[PDB]
Design a protein around this ligand. Structure first.
Ligand SMILES: Cc1cc2nc3c(=O)[nH]c(=O)nc-3n(C[C@H](O)[C@H](O)[C@H](O)COP(=O)(O)OP(=O)(O)OC[C@H]3O[C@@H](n4cnc5c(N)ncnc54)[C@H](O)[C@@H]3O)c2cc1C
Ligand SMILES: [Cl-]
Length: 381
């Protein structure tokens, strides 16, 4: 008995940002989520997320990162929740052996981003607590940093709801019925209709996009983050220990300085268990890899942060074959917008993606360059 302008299915990182953008424009919006965001079942918990700007993954990512950054600063001003701390982001790796480092350096040059370049002992001297070999080099971005991701979603929700967005929690969408002039969703709590649909179900996109007649390779991965007791005189945000994403011979790791004596947070990016989001084991430590992969990094590169394990979190990535996002209209339904496959690096962009999704839903087009995120691209298979 209630026809909405837009329904957003999956009110997480991308969905809640879209909800905020839509509500701000007086668009009558319903957001439906299987839980009550922010929560610990999806891809947005573990407290913190890196935002960096020197994005070597593709030129289209840079303006999206910079727009997202400005949007995060706007959110900071609009809410009482903490959104962003400017820790800086450090990227390091062996000289001439890391594509990730090389691409980051190239991106900073190409887009005139403010960065410091240093190598070997310079890294260790500037940040006590980091121990890299002399043959390592680094690029440091002073103006990027750390987002409080759960706070971001909660702030967007509070703001969207205040503007009149409706949020239906603990409600799993089970099926879709799409018409030329309308959209319909089916849930155990009831059916809802709108003019437009945004689909942003995270890891569950890999199970439920088939109900929209889509067959896109999306693989969900179990990705843990550990929290460790650290030397506060070295690893605290207060002493300018940076956020980091680094490439070493056995893969990519990311982490965060200790905030308020919380301890250093570390994750292993390039490995995770292939899982199903409905059967994933969400206890940290159930596989030996959970703790051991992290300690192997810390004992070598950040020895003073290799203390007691305080706790861990179990989170999910959803990967496409090319590790680029999917942000596009449904190829058969212009009234259906898809946001999927953020491939473990989407959160920093979620504010900007919210903007893109709102524009696609309302106009079928966006001012942003999203060509590399096309749902019809051959590399998606
Ligand atoms: C450990 C870890 C660390 C990360 N670190 C970074 C980082 O430093 N920087 C960065 O940029 N990115 C990072 N990411 C990636 C980023 O968190 C994700 O790319 C992003 O959160 C994906 O957002 P999403 O909206 O697609 O998914 P989510 O935020 O999980 O939202 C999906 C929502 O859909 C809901 N849903 C599912 N099924 C249904 C259904 N049937 N009906 C209704 N609702 C449903 C879920 O409840 C959920 O709320 C990290 C990810 C992990 C796992
Ligand atoms: Cl992801």
């Amino acid at each position: 008995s209630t026809h909405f302008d837009v329904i957003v299915v999956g009110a997480g990182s991308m969905g809640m940002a879209a909800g905020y953008q839509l509500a701000k424009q007086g668009v009558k919006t319903l957001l439906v989520d299987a839980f009550d965001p922010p929560h610990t079942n999806g891809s947005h918990h573990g407290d913190t997320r890196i935002i960096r700007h020197a994005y070597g993954e593709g030129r289209e990512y840079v303006p999206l990162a910079l727009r997202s950054q400005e949007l995060w600063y706007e959110l900071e001003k609009e809410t009482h929740h903490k959104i962003f701390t400017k820790t800086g982001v450090l990227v390091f790796g062996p000289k001439g052996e890391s594509a990730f480092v090389a691409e980051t350096m190239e991106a900073a040059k190409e887009h005139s981003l403010t960065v410091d370049l240093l190598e070997g002992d310079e890294i260790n001297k500037r940040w006590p607590g980091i121990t890299v070999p002399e043959n390592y080099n680094a690029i440091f971005e002073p103006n990027s940093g750390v987002l409080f991701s759960e706070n971001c979603i909660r702030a967007y929700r509070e703001l969207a709801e205040a503007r009149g967005a409706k949020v239906l929690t603990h409600t799993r969408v089970e099926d879709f019925d799409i018409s030329p002039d309308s959209v319909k969703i089916e849930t155990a709590n009831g059916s809802y209709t709108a003019d437009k649909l945004i689909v942003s179900m995270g890891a569950w996109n890999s199970k439920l996009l088939s109900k929209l007649n889509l067959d896109i390779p999306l693989q969900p991965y179990r990705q843990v983050v550990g929290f460790f007791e650290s030397d506060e005189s070295k690893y605290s945000n207060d002493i300018d220990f940076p956020g980091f994403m680094v490439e070493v011979p056995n893969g990519i790791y990311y982490g965060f300085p200790s905030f308020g004596g919380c301890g250093l947070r570390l994750g292993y990016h390039t490995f995770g268990q292939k899982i199903d989001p409905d059967t994933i084991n969400r206890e940290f430590g159930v596989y030996p890899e959970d703790e051991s992969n992290l300690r192997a990094f810390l004992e070598e590169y950040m020895p003073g942060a290799n203390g007691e394990l305080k706790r861990g979190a179990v989170c999910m990535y959803t990967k496409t074959l090319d590790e680029h996002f999917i942000i596009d209209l449904h190829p058969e339904h212009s009234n259906v917008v898809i946001a999927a496959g953020f491939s473990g690096h989407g959160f920093k962009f979620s504010s900007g993606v919210g903007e893109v999704l709102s524009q696609l839903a309302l106009t079928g087009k966006t001012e942003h360059d999203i060509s590399i995120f096309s749902i019809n691209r051959p590399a998606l298979k």
